[PDB]
Design a protein around this ligand. Structure first.
Ligand SMILES: [Zn+2]
Ligand SMILES: [Zn+2]
Lengths: 168, 72
């Protein structure tokens, strides 16, 4: 199906599927992963660009409320992260755990993605639902570097406890 | 899995993050793989596995809740 073709990066098959406008390019699979989520997760750059340029919604969420930008960051796909940001992805989008894309880039040591996220304004001090800030998921060298870079970019380093509309 | 207090080889590395251990450090041994306490956690929520139970998907480990939400 379309989801497998996006995971595998079968660009011709994806293009032919998108040509049929009766197909819904935003529709998620059984766990809410859209074509764009899979292409971003698996680093399929050509398919990501095609989906975005043909109109795919950038901030779609899967069953765990991850966006394509969470998945690209978690799996270290630097070019895809930059493409998503260029096309207005919410850089501080939160999933069901209150995690932002920077949490995953930090946790997985995706250093260049984490640095690019902070260069584009990603907040370093926003706790998830369990009180953990993104940069505190990083190993020390990266953790220290990202706080310094954020300070130099005019962020405030005060810890921000989690809040959302339904929290209290 | 079991908690250990490290006094092993200088070559020893965490299965998740590939960093080394300090003498006396509380670590986890799961099936012969060694982890920092902060690394033997679910890849999605970063929290400890309830009762030590995890589920693998493509080389990462998940708690039951996140595994069922995303991959089951
Ligand atoms: Zn580790
Ligand atoms: Zn979890």
């Amino acid at each position: 199906d379309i989801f497998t073709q996006c995971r595998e990066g079968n660009a011709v098959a994806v293009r032919l599927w998108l040509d049929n406008t009766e197909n819904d390019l935003n529709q998620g699979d059984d766990h809410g992963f859209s074509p764009l989520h899979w292409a971003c997760r698996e680093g399929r750059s050509a398919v990501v660009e095609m989906l975005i340029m043909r109109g795919a919604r950038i901030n779609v969420m899967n069953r765990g409320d991850d966006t394509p930008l969470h998945l690209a960051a978690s799996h270290g796909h630097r070019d895809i992260v930059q493409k998503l940001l260029q096309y207005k992805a919410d850089i501080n989008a939160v999933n069901e755990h209150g995690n932002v894309p920077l949490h995953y880039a930090c946790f997985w040591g995706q250093d260049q993605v984490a640095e690019d996220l902070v260069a584009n304004g990603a907040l370093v001090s926003i706790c998830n639902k369990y009180g953990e800030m993104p940069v505190d998921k990083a190993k020390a060298p990266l953790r220290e570097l990202l706080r310094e870079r954020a300070e130099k970019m005019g962020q405030n380093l005060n810890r921000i406890p989690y809040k959302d509309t339904f929290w209290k | 899995s079991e908690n250990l207090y490290f006094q092993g080889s200088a070559s020893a590395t965490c299965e998740r993050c590939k960093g080394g251990f300090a003498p006396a450090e509380k670590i986890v041994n799961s099936n012969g793989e060694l982890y920092h306490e902060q690394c033997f956690v679910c890849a999605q929520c970063f929290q400890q596995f309830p009762e030590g139970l995890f589920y693998e998907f493509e080389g990462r480990k998940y708690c039951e809740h996140d595994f069922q939400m995303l991959f089951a």
